[PDB]
């Protein structure tokens, strides 16, 4: 009867930020004690909601989005932020209600000689809407000269990979990020905390 938070936080595999995973959670009691009892999270930021209210309140659905970014990009997973990740990969709404959790995963997501599996979108015509997931791989026309679906002049593949090496600086090391979103629609709420 417990919510599958372990399935998200302890997942062996993590998605690239541009193709971020979303886990819909419903019909369970949510044990948030396991989360803030830990000391392994370098980031734990809550907007519009608190662990006390998390303990008592109930929500129609809660979403757990997870992905991997580098160290100094974690500041971009927040309302009203700009940058490659916020604008082109994962945007949070200005009225975001939820919590952002991130921890260093240099031990897992970095490989000797560099781990290039994790991708991010470097180029996009416009900014992502909140909670938008763009998995397009079309060539990006940076200028006026057209790209005929090919690597023409000023035309580039939009997705580029992090070069995650174990010896990278902290701001460039891989960080696993989990974003919890809590929505309360005008319908019976199936996600409840222990204090209810």
């Amino acid at each position: 009867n417990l919510c599958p938070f372990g399935e998200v936080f302890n997942a062996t595999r993590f998605a690239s930020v541009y193709a971020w995973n979303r886990k819909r959670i419903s019909n369970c009691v949510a044990d948030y004690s396991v989360l803030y009892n830990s000391a392994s999270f370098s980031t734990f930021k809550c907007y519009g909601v608190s662990p006390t209210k998390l303990n008592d309140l109930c929500f129609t659905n809660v979403y757990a989005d997870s992905f991997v970014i580098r160290g100094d990009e974690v500041r971009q997973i927040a309302p009203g932020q700009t940058g490659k990740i916020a604008d082109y990969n994962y945007k949070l709404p200005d009225d975001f209600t939820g919590c952002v959790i991130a921890w260093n995963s240099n031990n897992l997501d970095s490989k000797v000689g560099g781990n290039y599996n994790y991708l991010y979108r470097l180029f996009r015509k416009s900014n992502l809407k909140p909670f938008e997931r763009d998995i397009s791989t079309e060539i990006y026309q940076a200028g006026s000269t057209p790209c005929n679906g090919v690597e023409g002049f000023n035309c580039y593949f939009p997705l580029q990979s992090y070069g995650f090496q174990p010896t990278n600086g902290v701001g460039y090391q891989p960080y696993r990020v989990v974003v919890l979103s809590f929505e309360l629609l005008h319908a019976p709420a199936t996600v409840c905390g222990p204090g209810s």
Partner: antibody, heavy 117, light 108 residues
Amino acid sequence: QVQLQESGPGLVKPSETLSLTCAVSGYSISSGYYWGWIRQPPGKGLEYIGYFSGTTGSTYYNPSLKSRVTISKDTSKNQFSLKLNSVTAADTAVYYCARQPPRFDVWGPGVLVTVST
Amino acid sequence: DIQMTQSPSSLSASVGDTVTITCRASQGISNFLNWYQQKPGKAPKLLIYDASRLESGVPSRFSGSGSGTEFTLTISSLQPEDFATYHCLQYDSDPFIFGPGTKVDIKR
């Protein structure tokens, strides 16, 4: 965590071939991104030379410099080169190797190459 | 070749001032404009791309605007570290073209 380092002599005679090498550390060139060269004559503005795709090798050159310039990625050394034929006093400049041509975000410190007899 | 020019080309200002640098193109380049900061003995550093998008890690006092053939760079609350040479770049046509550069120095 990606660093660029130019290498090569600052000693080239007129009508000879200038040869420079950019050493990339912290990221494998062939894995991704695009890489190129920029130069700046002392006391003048910057000039674009060319760039290539790490993954595919697709190469582009400044039309005013074509037929003189060649950029190639070395095999099994993670570096790319610049070759400029028949240099003149107009080719004396500080030469930079840079990443992401459209928006040059990462630069090498630059090496001054003086063309003289 | 699209020719890029910078109007000020030299100016002096004091810490805490606001300055505006103008860069023009010989023809329409939409918003395919980059702004760079170069200090002596150093490579340029990217500041603004797409003529308004401020790069990550750059203070918000830098701002770019413009479209077509005219663009401007604005620096508010000038700080000592902001004094350097600034360049503009167009990526609309096959030869990437930079401006001549504009040098800002401390008023005294």
